[model samples]
Target: GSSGSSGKSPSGQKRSRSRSPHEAGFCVYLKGLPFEAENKHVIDFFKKLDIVEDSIYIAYGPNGKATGEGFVEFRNEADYKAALCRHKQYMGNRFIQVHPITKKGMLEKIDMIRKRLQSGPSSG
Candidate 1:
């Protein structure tokens, strides 16, 4: 079967898709979050990392469930780099993954997620 190209790999691993040159300097992808985590949790988790206010976008599944993934935009390239230092760091009991991403890719992923939610859950 094909990978389906919906932000996840065939084996269910989350993957970074693409990055645009404009947003390549400030946007970052965050993964491996706890399913129970919410937007506020993500904001707080990165509070000490010098993140910009209102720049965190948490991915949610259908029924508003947290997908354990999010996109964070830092204030500058330096802040983005500083945030990456926490890659593989633990968020509560779960280890989180962080990487650079493009703003366009981030928007596309969000749109995909919204469409998926609107279509309801996938059938097996």
Candidate 2:
């Protein structure tokens, strides 16, 4: 079976939408700067910018070096957009790169797996 929907829906059909450019999203695989220190500074900056605490998500890898990567989810699109505009070059740090999370990319990844499955097993 095809992975994607083959049929068209009614007028009210709500197709899956990618994370809006303004919506809560992520900054993944950050490089440089200590994660812990960056978290404190980044969180403070966010708070100063009026970002809510509940909407943010931060995590460190098991090794936890300057592999600086974290995520900030704003309460709404407005806040997210504000941050994007005002904080894009935030402190000239190379580690921070913000972008919208798209379902299309994820769907493509899934489709790759589906194709692999359909191709049957192979010995390494």
Candidate 3:
């Protein structure tokens, strides 16, 4: 009795089946930002570069303080490359550090950080 999602029904020993998840895209990593900067304010930095698609991750440390860094996504190659070109550009009085990263990589980094920070003496 088979349920569903059978790419090969009568496969004796198939290496793997095909299924997919996670939409990957060009992402940017930024540091040295204003701790108080929110999504709205951060997007402004990229306003002249390209469309940010309203996808941004502004995170904070376990101490409940902004990390002064985050990750964001873009629409296309144009936007992604444009962002890289503006690395170390000034957002205000201070210069912000910018670098390119993959969607998967960003997810891994964020996840690891979250687990590390949230792994305090809260659970067994």
Top of the candidates by lDDT: 3
lDDT (0 to 1) per candidate: 0.70, 0.43, 0.70
Give lDDT tens digits, candidate 3, residues 8-116: 2121222322245666688888776776767865787777655555568877877777777788888777778888887657666655777777688777768777775
- Candidate 2, residues 40-114, lDDT tens digits: the string is 655654554554455333444445433343445555556656665543334233334444444244334344434
| Clash list (residue pairs), candidate 1 | none
Candidate that beats the other on lDDT, 1 or 2, i.e. the better one:
1
TM-score of each: 0.70, 0.42, 0.66
In model 2, state the lDDT of residue 13: 24
Q: Model 3: runs farther than 4 Å from truth?
A: 1-24, 49-54, 116-124
Inter-residue clash pairs, candidate 2: none
Q: How many clashes in each structure?
A: 0, 0, 0
Q: Per TM-score, what order, best first?
A: 1, 3, 2
Per-residue lDDT of model 1, residues 1-124, tens digit only: 8956423222236555433345344778877777887766677666766665577777777766788888888776766777767665667766677777777777778877777766656551
Please estimate how well model 3 matches the true structure, expressed as its whole-model Cα lDDT: 0.70
Error of 1 at 4 (Å): 40
